[PDB]
Each structure stands twice: as structure tokens, then as C-alpha cells.
Design a protein around this ligand. Sequence first.
Ligand SMILES: [Zn+2]
Length: 258
Amino acid sequence: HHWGYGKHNGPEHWHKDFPIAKGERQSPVDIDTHTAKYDPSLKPLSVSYDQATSLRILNNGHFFNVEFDDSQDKAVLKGGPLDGTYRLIQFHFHWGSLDGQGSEHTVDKKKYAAELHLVHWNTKYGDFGKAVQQPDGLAVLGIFLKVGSAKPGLQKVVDVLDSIKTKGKSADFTNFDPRGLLPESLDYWTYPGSLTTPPLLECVTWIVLKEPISVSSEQVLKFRKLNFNGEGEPEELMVDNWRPAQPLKNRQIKASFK
Ligand SMILES: [Zn+2]
């Protein structure tokens, strides 16, 4: 039936409905830090989230999405390896059933507890749906989450999860500041890739930050109480909603630091 992360509709079956799954620039990948090329011509990242406008949070049956108002250049990403302005449209997470798994990207084979994706689309294309059809259409900022001390800025999100426990639920989620999810360093690795979920389009420029943010066991624990299933259906906990690393192929990973 519909795609998911279970043994019968998991990542290893996606190729049957989405042939692009076995493509040449699939994500995520394992970042080998020793072969990543430090590229000195890379510009620093420019994150302008000061006028961001969050609208809603939704449980889509795969993960939850916090959506932003992308009708104007409110929250944008520029610089780095990018050309043009990219608007933040939404962010989501991928997490595991345990602290030693959860992230999609890995660093030297190391998996983190979760991974945050800040999705932006190139304003040049007018809308998100057009942008996903272009090789430079999207820019996703990936941030690793490790278990340690609480991330104060993540609490608003953790607080509201009980209201969107099942598939299809959504809640008003205004006035959230995404700057609170950012680590203090903006050093990163960058490579051309794809969406990690169907349709798995190869329109993404990945910007994975080196420094992960720490969240508490309690904070992460609440993510794990979400449901994949719809209301009234048999409870299936939302865990391990991550895709395993794909072959890098004809691609080089560049770093903005040495
Ligand atoms: Zn994602």
C-alpha cells in the first residue's frame, strides 16, 4: 500500500513505485570526512530567519512538519554553495527507536539520535512544486541531534506533540523561532542529492552542518510517542522513520572548513 518505514513498505521497497530510488544522486549518504574536499571558494552561509512566520504543525503519518509562510522572502537561506534566495517552507525530523540510530546522514559511519531538515526552495521558480522539478530547486539544511543536555528552543515543539499524536492531525503553531534550533557554528559539508522520501526527486543541494545540537533524553522520548497510524487504528509508534545511506557514485562532498 502507501510507502512507509515498515518491513513491507520500507525504504527497500520504494524502488518499485519510485524507480528514481536507484538513481545517481540519491540521499542520504555517509560523509567520509577524510575524503571530503575542503573547498576554499565556498562562501559562508547566510541564514535570515529573523522575520520567519510559522503557521502550523502536522502529523503526516511519516513524521511531523512545522510549516512556514513562504509567500514573501521572510525566512531565507543564501550564500554557501547556493545561487539565489531560498525560502524556508518547512522543517521536520527523522529519529530512531534508540539513541544510537535516527539520523539519515552519517559521519564516518557514525549515526546520531535524530536529524533535522530545514527545507527551502529557490525563489527563481515561483513555487515549491516547480522547484522540485529542477536540479538546483531545493536547499535542505541538515542538523544532527545528539542526546545530552536540553535544547530550550525545541521545547515549544515537544510541548505540542500530544495534540498531533496520530496521522492527519495538525495544530496551530504560530510564533516559533527556528533560530533556536541552530548550533553556534555554521561550518558544513555540501553535496548534490535528493529528497530522502518519495518521490525522491534529485533536486536537492544538501548542506549538512558539522556541529550537532544536543537534546535531552526526555525531549527525544516524546518524539517516540507519535503514531504512524490514524486515529482509532491500531497503534504503531513513530520510530525509525529514517532512510539508510545510499551509494555516493559520481559525487564529491565538499567542506567549508579544514
Ligand atoms: Zn527529511
